[PDB]
Amino acid sequence: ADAVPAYPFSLPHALDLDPHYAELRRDEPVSRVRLPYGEGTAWLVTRMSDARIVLGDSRFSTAAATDPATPRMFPTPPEPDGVLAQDPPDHTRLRRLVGKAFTARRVEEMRPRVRSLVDSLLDDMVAHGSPADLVEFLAVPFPVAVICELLGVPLEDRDLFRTFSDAMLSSTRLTAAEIQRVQQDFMVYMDGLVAQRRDAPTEDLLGALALATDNDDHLTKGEIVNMGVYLLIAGHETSVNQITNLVHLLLTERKRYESLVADPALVPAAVEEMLRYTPLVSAGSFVRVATEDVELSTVTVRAGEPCVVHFASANRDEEVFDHADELDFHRERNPHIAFGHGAHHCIGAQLGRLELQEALSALVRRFPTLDLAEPVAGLKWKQGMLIRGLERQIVSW
Ligand code: HEM
Ligand SMILES: CC[C@H]1OC(=O)[C@H](C)[C@@H](O)[C@H](C)[C@@H](O)[C@@H](C)C[C@@H](C)C(=O)[C@H](C)[C@@H](O)[C@H]1C
């Protein structure tokens, strides 16, 4: 006895936006939806101004969305000791565990390591010679290397935590039980890695996490260990996919790649523009519940009513960006929310920006002749995961 549309609206194609988003933005920017898991209905938010209220305002709570009955985009009910499920000021204390490491200053200190590493992998890829798989030689091994040195994870457990991570970024691919099983193995594995540091500490985040275990009376082991897991998932899954998406946008209208080849200083502003353009999050968002009535553009969201944001739709608001439907690397202003907004703003924002910058610059400088060497129609996009990206990107040069 309800007539609210199912969200997501459709199964996704490549990085293509469902057109209902541009319709919704014009005519019904705040609309009711039935999310694929949990009970009941949620407001979908599709415009920037509203997005910033749902993400920004203290009267939207993510902790409140831990209730199993709360609508959600993913099978498992969310982990209460997860970062995304903390409201400030508890969220601020947790963010502070690890925050020092990810400041724009420290991340910039990594450009040299990160550059000599991208360089090394691009070597192995010219050893093997054209044509090769950009995913095998750059997209997976580069982000995986950086997060492992940063965290202090053994680069040799890659297949183990990659497996764990693909499962936990499941939308429709795996079931609640498949996923809760993987979670407990990850918890226990990550809990194991921090204990290795009990009588032998390390100069790496896992070190910091170990220290917080017996030297912080306000943070729980749940919270501390989950930070290891979430950093480790997010710290490679986002960048890996997001390199394949950037390369895909550039090579499909080769024009774009050629613009960067001429001026490898446009790379930073094109990363920011392609961060705006790309729906890396396939649909929805970690859900926020109103704790008090809150005024969005067209509706007062009531205390108890869930909302969910679509980052990529807010990034195509024509009130905020001139010619939003079009890729333009010479925009003067680009106030995108590809990295979210408010309390939960990406902690890796600066690292991901560095990782993409160094990946693209390198390609655009050493491989002028880079094209796709498989058809645009046969491209193996990852299916049934909360995030989009290619499983293989065979390139020629
Ligand atoms: C291109 C790279 C990346 C993109 C596009 C991206 C995108 C996003 C977005 C949109 C959010 C906001 C979620 C929300 O409030 O609902 C987010 C949060 C997050 N990002 Fe990323 N991300 C990237 C790289 C990274 C990296 C490298 C890490 C870790 C090293 C990371 C860790 C996270 C974490 C932990 C959060 C949640 C923090 C919190 O709850 O306060 N991300 N990311
Ligand atoms: C609804 C889709 C969202 O996924 C979720 O909420 C997931 C259940 C989270 O537990 C995932 C697995 C965590 O690792 C995140 C910290 C990863 C980080 C990159 C993001 O926050 C990301 C934008 C995320 O919010 C969305 C993909």
Author numbering: 11 to 407
Paper text:
The 8.8a-oleandolide epoxygenase OleP, from Streptomyces antibioticus, is the P450 involved in the polyketide biosynthesis of the antibiotic oleandomycin. It introduces an epoxide function to the C8-C8a of the macrolactone ring of two structurally different intermediates, namely the aglycone 8.8a-oleandolide (DEO) and the C3-mono-glycosylated L-olivosyl-8.8a-deoxyoleandolide (L-O-DEO). Substrate binding to the cytochrome P450 OleP is coupled to a large open-to-closed transition that remodels the active site, minimizing its exposure to the external solvent. When the aglycone substrate binds, a small empty cavity is formed between the I and G helices, the BC loop, and the substrate itself, where solvent molecules accumulate mediating substrate-enzyme interactions.
This reduces to some extent the volume of the active site in both mutants, which is ~606.7 Å3 in the wild type and ~582.5 and ~566.8 Å3 in G92W and S240Y, respectively. In G92W and S240Y mutants, the bulkier and more hydrophobic groups are located in the cavity, causing, respectively, the partial and the total displacement of the solvent molecules and resulting in the formation of direct interactions between the enzyme and the substrate. Within the solvent cavity, the aromatic side chain of S240Y and G92W form additional direct and directional contacts with the substrate and with other residues within the distal pocket, inducing the partial or the total removal of solvent molecules from that region. The insertion of a tryptophan in position 92 and of a tyrosine in position 240 also generate additional contacts within the protein structure, involving residues located in the active site of the enzyme. Indeed, while the effect of the ionic strength on the spin state equilibrium of the wild type and E89Y is comparable, showing the total low-to-high spin shift at I = 2.5–3 M, in G92W and S240Y mutants the shift is not complete even at the highest ionic strength conditions tested (I = 3.5 M). Therefore, at physiological ionic strength conditions, substrate binding to G92W and S240Y mutants cannot trigger the structural transition that induces the displacement of the water molecule from the sixth coordination position of the iron and the spin-state shift, not even on a partial population of the enzyme, as it occurs in the case of wild type and E89Y variants. On the other hand, in crystals obtained at higher ionic strength (I ~4.4 M), we observed only closed monomers of the complex for all mutants.
